Design a binder for this molecule. Structure first.
Ligand SMILES: *CC(=O)N1N=C(c2ccccc2)[C@H](c2ccccc2)[C@@H]1c1ccccc1
Ligand SMILES: *CC(=O)N1N=C(c2ccccc2)[C@H](c2ccccc2)[C@@H]1c1ccccc1
Lengths: 306, 306
């Protein structure tokens, strides 16, 4: 019993973290096989970041201008290329600690673990959700760029996020491992609108099922609702509209608890309209939306990894 | 910027996790040098747990009755001994992945990371506090026994907790690595009173300083207080009494923010008496007490580990 925001074990990702320096800028890189992936803004100074022409800046850089260090050993850079907002530095040695991996572009609402790094060294690990507005609410200081987000499936690491920047609002933005930003963000020091953030309705419902499983049931009511009726309430509270795909995904939790998805929706509707009245659910005084249905089942089943 | 409940990178601890089986009972063990540490209740059946005589049960077990498996390799057990509530199984091979380590007995209020394991395999990592009543609020299913709690200081892992049981109330109990329980708990299936839990006042204050550092300042008031005056309010709300040692420990955060500790105490007093009025602090609708002053500074400075 008990429900916690759990991150994946970070061991396989720690073995891939390297320090990348170009000029006076140092950040983190990800060493997989004979390639080191890192944000392309490693080639910029603080002044370049106001309006960088990455193509022109990269032309003035040669392989020897990139210093890659894994622990205390220096890797020899024999190739460099820019793919969207990421730099791929080809090194002469394959990482002997390269785990089985995939590069994946996650959907908004999905979750992943972040291994926050500074100077190529890990400092901590935490679980994040890709918000519907394609930002993340992480913990990232200067030098954390290049830290990655990932999921583990038994022995396979699916990398999905690379940290690039903090918006003036305090939230974080980054790319997938092909260097494509999540959201409309660009890698430059300019004010950028993230847009209205909405609550991940399917995740709040999954967390309500995790609550019932762990004995927190005060919020269960004698009401039911319809998809269109619940969505009228969801639109008023800036919650993502619920679809039959989301209902289908909640099927296993509904079968386990004996509570129909539309009955859980009615309970959520009452919590939205009336608040929590000074009560808590799984130790929280607000509705949590950072657990997918897959996170709830994984945690309640104790699925393990290599 | 941003503030998260961050766990230490778990890589050094993953390399130490093994599966220990005795009869039909399987749980996790910690392999450091040529010794495997695990809960002594690995020698029990479900029926033995009602009133176990560990000494009599252990006498019927020989080295060959303990199956220790690290990944797919079987370790040869050449010695066994019981130290308080832990079994120490001497194996013929030292763990080649043994990190630099220490065994430490933490104080109530201090924090640590838990690497939840099943069958010797890691499933996840999260940060916990040792509550003032010596319980932890973790996430532990059947088979999670033997999972450990730890802290990292650069290259050194200080193990402080080994999971032993879940109380009928849903909270968790365990030992230090010498097998001494934290709290008055015993390793038997009997109802056990954890006692009144109190809020870690020094940690709530440290988290209020983390809030100010990250721009959340609505709660700052025009009042001050005294230690005895604040403690009258602390006793009413089941908060740990604040001492000059706690004030001394908050010194660096007070010097960084320019906010005197007694002024932060007055703000906390107003939050306790008036509530949060539907507002949030660092994304939470309640007062968080699972961050020590050392966790706030470490996170705000980005201290890294090996
Ligand atoms: C994420 C990160 O560490 N850093 N990101 C920036 C940045 C991103 C977008 C717009 C402006 C700045 C910082 C930076 C500073 C100078 C050159 C490139 C990036 C910041 C950082 C700080 C120190 C070293 C590397 C990166
Ligand atoms: C922590 C854990 O996995 N387990 N703890 C107990 C336990 C502890 C205290 C009192 C009763 C039971 C479970 C257990 C069951 C049978 C024998 C010993 C311990 C439980 C567990 C489940 C499966 C394998 C090992 C341990």
């Amino acid at each position: 019993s008990g429900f916690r925001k759990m991150a994946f074990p970070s061991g396989k990702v720690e073995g891939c973290m390297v320090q990348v320096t170009c000029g006076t800028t140092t950040l983190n890189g990800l060493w997989l096989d004979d390639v080191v992936y890192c944000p392309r803004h490693v080639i910029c100074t603080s002044e370049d970041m106001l309006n960088p022409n990455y193509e022109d800046l990269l032309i003035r850089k040669s392989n020897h201008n990139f210093l890659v260090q894994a622990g205390n050993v220096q890797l020899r850079v024999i190739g460099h290329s820019m793919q969207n907002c990421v730099l791929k530095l080809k090194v002469d040695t394959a990482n002997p600690k390269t785990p089985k991996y995939k590069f994946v572009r996650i959907q908004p609402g999905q979750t992943f673990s972040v291994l926050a790094c500074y100077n190529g060294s890990p400092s901590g690990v935490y679980q994040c959700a890709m918000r519907p507005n394609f930002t993340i609410k992480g913990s990232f200081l200067n030098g954390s760029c290049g830290s990655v987000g990932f999921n583990i499936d038994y022995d396979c690491v699916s990398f999905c996020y690379m940290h690039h920047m903090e918006l003036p609002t305090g939230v974080h933005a980054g790319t997938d491992l092909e260097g494509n930003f999540y959201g409309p963000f660009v890698d430059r020091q300019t004010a950028q609108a993230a847009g209205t953030d909405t609550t991940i309705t399917v995740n709040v419902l999954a967390w309500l099922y995790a609550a019932v499983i762990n004995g927190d049931r005060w919020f269960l009511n004698r009401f039911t609702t319809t998809l269109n009726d619940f969505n009228l309430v969801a639109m008023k509270y800036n919650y993502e509209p619920l679809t039959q795909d989301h209902v289908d995904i909640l099927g296993p939790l509904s079968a386990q608890t004996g509570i129909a998805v539309l009955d859980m929706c009615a309970s959520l509707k009452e919590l939205l309209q009336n608040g929590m009245n000074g009560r808590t659910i799984l130790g929280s005084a607000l509705l949590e939306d950072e657990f997918t249905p897959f996170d709830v089942v994984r945690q309640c089943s104790g699925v393990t990894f290599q």
